[PDB]
């Protein structure tokens, strides 16, 4: 038996409280309707998956032996923190929800809620897609994010295929704040050594629906009673928690809002062949 | 136990990234309110079911034996991929969700959500229906789609019957991207060797509600512990996943949007009476 | 010992046949306005009704005088609303456009009130009558095209406000297809001891319709003592009503209800009873 | 050994009888305006109330002084709201039309607040008082048409803001039908040991009413020790309240609450007690 | 070290927790709005200082249980173990009111219709533990201006983390130093403090949130359900010092002012009934 705790901070676009965008950590950069067509869509405008690898106590001195020991993740407790902050109606720079001569409340955080968490023994497998195959993305050296066609490398005239399923558009979630949610999803064709759980509610004004409790556990064992086996004695957790949007007052454009997620994974030892 | 994996790409109307409509693959053609009355409704304006038959390993050397082996589908995992892409508020040509002089976001994908998947040992049985019996449909040779009255062959003065249940309007889901969702539904009076599961949320602005996970399975065994029996060593898989609509900015017409679905079907060998 | 029974029930939303002047709106209701029943007489074609049918089962007993008889017992059923995919249409005929007045957008889809109920019993489903407005004016026909609670209760005109509560005399059996309007009749929970009914309702004019369809789900009809509905006279009685929303006309924004057909598959067994 | 009990509870939305001047709006409330209770005295007919009734059961004991006595024990119940189909009406008398000003569209259907609760017990249901506005003005008549929390707590006027929280003195028994308003009284969870109540609430003015009806479902009334409500005095007490939405008037856009009758079927058995 | 249960070994506890939406007492100038928050405007906290009365807070209370051990230096002692509890929000029916004082009218400009009912954000949580509930701090806006009084009427996450002004944007993520214990009624704002899942090993909390300004409130109430407080090992919270700690917060929606369309939060009281048993422990 053993237990592992850690926090995953949100990666909505502004992924660090530094630089010019310092004051909007935990948010995305402002997004307009023609972005990606009038201009190049920035990394800071695309909410990304969070990820982390935890080094577990190394179990095998000689890895050449036929019978080895491995950490097996049996269950997990996970929770999104800071949900109470979403009741705010005094949001900075946010649009007022009232008539022209009023002094009413600001728009609260509302809209798209995308929530996923994953526990596995190796990086999460991702499948790429594009809502618009010809969306213009900015490029920097080094790269601040990675998009499906950076791997599939289809000709520019063939990028409409990315609106369906491109088998070459696959990747591993091997870097935090690097894979945009709107382009990558957990790959159901793989992820045999991982468990992921996701839900999505669209719309711009949809009421956010979130729960939080410390009395619920997610069992990670499969039908055979075997959970994720941590290769290299590494535990891989990943998440994504878009909780809604903020509506700017001046031009009504939006930023996504994310919240931190907590993990407590319970592991046992298993002998493998 | 053997597992079979495959993807079913969406057939919303623009069913291939080729031609003039190449850039809107995975979407439908633009739809206006008077389409089908002011003109002929196009096949690219009607989302259709996706289907595929998978050839399984041949099991029998002689089909006249009283006892034969058949592949039995016992369970399945299925998932709609690309759900995170539905958060986009920078959609091409989409209507802006803000005031007249603003520079706000675009409408995200929202509206009708029609999600169904099916696993069987033979093509899925379909039942035809029309919301408007007198809807005008375009015709090409060869046909790009098939409609209920193409089989029922009712006189034009009797097509209002298709707004109810016309028993002669039956078909098998035997062609990918051919049977429109708005005209064909899984036939509950048949499909004894298939299992289908469907859900529908209407409206044009409804927030889409979707889930994705790899820790959930659907048991395909019936009350007698028998799953679909693959006739001719063929596993038949069907789906249709309308995830909402995109609203044009210039004239506010809509395109349906669909997403690919994945299948992992678990099968075993069963001996049956012949 | 065992038998299965299949049948369809076509919707009875008002226009109950693809014949006559209203032929093209079979499966819909007649157009309804806010003052109908007040400035004019409300028509039966404007009132969705329950669908019902009696299925003749194989005869079980020869001498009906015998002390011990045999009855068919419905144990389970599968039921499904077919044609749900047609509700995605945004090109509905004569429908209001869902966009700015100077656009060329889609039509309003079928949305709004969803009233879904099905029933299986050994006798006609017992109904209880009610009125949302006691003084609603209903058209009169001989023979009648529909029946209303006061046709049975027969209260004086000045006492019809009682029908907005519960009038015990306002009771009937669902004994005629396309005859008992939904807005006036409900399953009677004070009876129906030999029937099983399951119903749900979601109101509003713009509510998104929420419907499911599958063939891997059954409904067990046995009660807490393991007894299902016993078919009297060797007759199986099925009932249903499936309002899936409304259509909004473009010219004056009035509405029509819309329904879809429902399928039944009931499994029955033989059961001995005392006469 | 075992008995069954049936009874109907008619709604007490304000107009609590099909007699008098407000005869035609039985089953509804009186019209409610925003400034009512401030511009005037709020009427009892403007406040939906709980229904209740005591059902006399067969007498069991010839001497209430014996150490061992028999009592009726309610083990399970079947309850249903009737008339749900009537909520589809879009031709409500005097109701606001939901269409453009030049149109001839349908009326507003019944929608908005849904407050549904039923209770079964061996004695009157215990209630706890509250006020959303402590200084609400209530009309007075002799005999009283309803009762309010401060009629029992008897706080001075300048301290009535306490009733916007928890005032322990504002307690009462549901001992009179069409007498205790819903907006002032809730079931008291600090008591009601000999009762079972089940309630739900969806607010707002335009929320779609969501209701179900079936005769295949029962509610078990036993507690964790397998004991149900014991009927003191051989009397069974049932209570309810079923606000199903509001009607909006066309002329001033004010509202009436609308309720529906509720049916009860309670199964009882004989139990010996000390 | 938890041992076995001792089989007068049980007891029951009841109490009410009144809402602390900001106006936390029916006294003073804000007396008439007890159970509500103070009026809130969009630019509050930016062009002025946000007040304690404008920030709904958690309710909490300690219940003194019967003393179990006379000699606290004994090797084997006994503690109260909370096994289950019933909890209920009272006054839910009051939320049907459409004649709310000073509330905006929901009708056309020349009409006389109903007021807006209570609707909007719903935040409902309750917690039962053997010690104060652990809290984790956060800020929706890092630079929100908060009014300060001596003594303080509420506490904010940066009062503990003590970050410099140019680093308060970290409070929009997870600042580990911003932790506290729910040890004071009407003092910890809901919009800044959440139950800390990295701690609270001796507490059980259950919460849900539905946002938006016009969302229909959805609440239930019944006396026929219990919440089992035992963990996976069959051990409920152990009450250190024979003290039972109950916490809650029940924002049920907002009231919209008619004159300027600004809002007040509204809360309702919550009831608790905790069942406890005697559990042996090793000191
Ligand atoms: Mg695989
Ligand atoms: Mg069949
Ligand atoms: Mg009866
Ligand atoms: Mg008590
Ligand atoms: Mg810990």
> If DSSP codes are grouped into helix, strand and coil, which group holds residue C207?
coil
Backbone angles phi, psi at E107, to 5 degrees: -170, 170
Q: Do E114 and D202 touch (CB under 8 A)?
A: no
Residue in B9, B77, B110 closest to A164 by CB = B9
What is the DSSP code string of A211-269?
A: EEESS--EE---TTS---B-GGGEEEEEEEEEEEEEEBSSS--EEEEE--EEEEEEEEE
Nearest to E96 by CA among D47, D247, D189: D47
Alpha carbon distance E92, A229 (integer Å): 49
User: D195 and D236 in contact (C-beta within 8 Å)?
Assistant: no
**CA-based nearest distance A52→chain E, Å:** 16
Distance from the CA of A161 to the center of ligand 4, in angstroms? 66
Q: Which chains touch C (3 or more CB pairs under 8 A)?
A: B, D
- Rounded CA-CA distance D258/D261 in Å is 11
**Which phi-psi region, left, alpha or beta, contains residue D189 (left: φ > 0; alpha: ψ -120 to 50)?**
alpha
Question: Is the distance from CB of C2 to CB of C75 less than 8 angstroms?
Answer: no
- The order of strands in the sheet holding A261-272 is A2-8, A261-272, A68-80, A218-219
Name the residue among A176, A48, A167 with its Cα closest to residue A116.
A48
C-beta neighbour count of C76 within 10 angstroms: 17
Interface with B, mutate which of C91, C113, C210 (most B CBs under 10 A): C91
Please judge whether E42 and A103 are an interchain contact, meaning their C-beta atoms are less than 8 angstroms apart: yes
Q: Is C46 helix (H, G, I), strand (E, B) or coil?
A: helix
Where are any strands of DSSP class E within chain E? 2-5, 10-17, 59-64, 76-89, 122-129, 133-137, 179-182, 193-195, 203-210, 218-222, 227-228, 243-256, 263-267, 270-282
Structure tokens at D64: 């209430």
Please give the DSSP secondary-structure letter assigned to residue C86: G
B131 marked as part of a ligand binding site: no
Query: Per DSSP, what are the bridge partners of residue D58?
Result: none
Sign of CA dihedral E185, E189, E190, E192: negative
Q: Residue E29: CB partners within 8 Å, gap ≥ 6?
A: none
The token duo for C211 is: 């419907």
d(CA B196, CA B219) in angstroms, rounded, equals 11
On chain B, the residues whose CB falls within 8 A of the CB of C27 are 163-164
**Residue list, annotated binding site of E:** 14, 198, 201
d(CA B265, CA B7): 12
- From the number of C-beta atoms within 10 Å of its C-beta (0-12, 13-18, 19+), residue A141 rates as exposed
CB pairs under 8 A between C and D: 188
3-class SS at C189? coil
| HEC assignment per residue over A151-195 | HHCCCHHHHHHHHCCCCCCEEECCCCCCCECCCEEECCCCCCCEE
Identify whether the C-beta of residue E84 lies closer than 8 Å to the C-beta of residue D224: no
The CA-based angle C188-C192-C198, given to 5 degrees, is 75
> Do the chains contact at A81 and E251, CB–CB below 8 Å?
no
Report d(CA B119, CA B217) in Å as an integer: 13
Name residues 206-235 of chain B within 8 A of A (Cβ).
206-215, 217
How many domains does one find in chain C? 1
Residue-by-residue DSSP string for chain D: -EEEEEEEE---SS--SS-STTGGGTTBPPPB-TTTTTTSPBPGGGS-B-EEEEEEPPP--S-TTSSSEEEEEEEEEEEEE--GGGGG-S--TTBPB-S-TT---PBPPSBS-EEEEEEEESSPPEEEE--SSTT--B---SS-S---HHHHH---GGGGGGGGS--TT-EEE--STT-SBTTTEEE-TTS-TTEEEEEEEE-SSSPPPEEEEESS--EE---TTS---EEGGGEEEEEEEEEEEEEEBTTT--EEEEE--EEEEEEEEEEEE-
Task: Judge whether A5 is annotated as a binding position.
Answer: yes
Is B184 at the interface with chain A, CB within 8 A?
Answer: no
Segment 101-140 of chain A within 8 Å of chain E by CB: 102-110
Give the pair of three-digit tokens for residue D39: 């511009």
Q: Is the dihedral of CA B82, B83, B84, B90 positive or negative?
A: positive
Residue A152 has which token pair?
A: 């599939």
Closest residue by Cα to residue B183 from C85, E216, E156: C85
- C132–D105 C-beta distance less than 8 A: no
User: In this structure, are residues E234 and E192 in contact, taking their beta carbons and an 8 Å threshold?
Assistant: no
Distance from CA of C161 to the nearest CA of D (A): 5
Those of residues 73-92 in D touching chain C at CB distance below 8 A are 78, 80, 82-92
**What's the distance, CA A123 to chain centroid?**
13
- For residues E229 and E245, the answer to whether their CB atoms sit within 8 Å is no
Chains D+E touching (3+ CB pairs under 8 Å): yes
- Residues of chain B contacting residue C93, judged by C-beta atoms under 8 Å apart: 36-37, 132, 134-135
Binding-site residue positions of E for Mg(2+): 14, 198, 201
CB atoms within 10 A of CB C153: 18
Q: How far apart are CA E118 and CA A155, in angstroms?
A: 56
Q: Do A198 and B212 touch (CB under 8 A)?
A: yes
Q: Do C91 and B194 touch (CB under 8 A)?
A: no
Ligand 1 centroid to Cα of residue B84, in Å, is: 21
**Residue B118: which residues within 8 A CB-CB, separation 6 or more?**
B124, B186, B194, B195, B196, B197, B236, B237, B238, B239
B29 neighbors A164 (Cβ within 8 angstroms)? no
Ligand nearest to the CA of A127: 1
**Ramachandran sector of residue D107 (left: φ over 0; alpha: ψ -120 to 50; beta: rest):** beta
Q: How far apart are CA D208 and CA E162, in angstroms?
A: 48
In this complex, do C248 and D105 lie within 8 Å of one another by their Cβ atoms? yes
Distance (Å, whole) CA B49 – CA B53: 13
Q: B20: distance to nearest CA of chain C, Å?
A: 22
**Residue C259, both tokens:** 């329904």
**D247 forms bridges with which residues in the sheet?**
D256
Alpha-carbon distance of E99 to E110, in angstroms, equals: 17
Q: Determine which helix (DSSP H) or strand (DSSP E) holds C173, and give its type and residue range.
A: strand C171-173
CB atoms within 10 A of CB D53: 15
Q: What does the alpha-carbon distance between residue A213 and residue E205 come to, in Å, rounded to a whole number?
A: 6
Whether the ω angle into residue A142 lies within 30 degrees of 0, i.e. cis, is yes
Record: contact A82-E138, CB cut-off 8 A: yes
Place of tokens 């939006």: A254
Is B97 an interface residue toward C (CB < 8 Å)?
Answer: no
Q: Which domain does A194 fall in, by range?
A: 1-273
Distance CA C257, CA C11 (A): 11
Distance from CA of A115 to the nearest CA of E (A): 15
Resolution (A): 2.3
What CATH number did the domain enclosing E17 receive? 2.60.175.10
Tell me the CA–centroid distance for residue A211 and ligand 5, in Å: 20
Q: Which of D207, D221, D35 is nearest to D109 (CA)?
A: D207
Do C and D touch (≥3 CB pairs < 8 Å)? Answer: yes
C-alpha distance from residue D213 to each of A10, C117, D88 (Å):
45, 9, 15
Please give the Cα distance from A158 to B151 (Å, whole number). 38
Nearest to E79 by CA among E221, E234, E267, E278: E278
User: Is the separation of the CB atoms in E83 and E229 below 8 Å?
Assistant: yes
Chains that touch E (3 or more CB pairs under 8 A): A, D
Cβ within 8 Å of C, B 33-72: 33-37, 41, 47
Q: Is C107 annotated as a binding residue?
A: no
Experimental method: X-ray
Indicate which of D114, D132, D161 best probes the interface with E, i.e. most E CBs within 10 Å of its own CB. Answer: D132
Question: Looking at the complex, does the CB of residue C190 fall below 8 Å from at least one CB of chain D?
Answer: yes
């Amino acid at each position: 038996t053993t237990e592992i705790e850690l926090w995953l901070e949100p990666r909505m676009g502004v992924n660090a409280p530094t630089g010019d965008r310092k004051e909007w950590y935990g948010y995305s950069e402002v997004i307009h309707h023609a972005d990606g067509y009038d201009n190049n869509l920035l990394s800071v405008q695309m909410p990304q998956y969070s990820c982390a690898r935890v080094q577990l106590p190394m179990l095998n001195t000689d890895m050449t032996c036929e019978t080895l020991m491995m950490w097996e993740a049996v269950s997990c407790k996970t929770e999104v923190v800071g949900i109470g902050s979403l009741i705010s109606v005094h949001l900075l720079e946010a649009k007022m929800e009232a008539g022209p001569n009023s002094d009413g409340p600001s728009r609260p955080i509302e809209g798209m809620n995308y929530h996923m968490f994953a526990v596995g023994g190796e990086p999460l497998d991702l499948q790429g897609i594009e809502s618009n195959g010809q969306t213009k993305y900015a490029t920097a050296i080094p790269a601040k994010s990675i998009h499906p066609n950076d791997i599939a490398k289809l000709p520019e005239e063939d990028k409409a295929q990315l609106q369906g399923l491109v088998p070459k558009a696959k990747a591993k979630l091997d870097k935090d704040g690097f894979y945009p949610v709107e382009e990558w999803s957990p790959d159901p064709s793989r992820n045999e050594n991982s468990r992921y759980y996701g839900s999505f509610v669209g719309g711009l004004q949809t009421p956010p629906n979130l729960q939080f409790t410390n009395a619920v556990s997610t069992v990670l064992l499969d039908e055979n009673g075997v959970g994720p086996l941590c290769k290299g004695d590494g535990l891989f957790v990943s998440c994504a928690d878009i909780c809604g949007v903020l509506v700017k007052a001046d031009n009504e454009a939006i930023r996504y809002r994310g919240l931190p997620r907590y993990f407590k994974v319970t592991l046992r030892k298993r002998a493998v062949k």
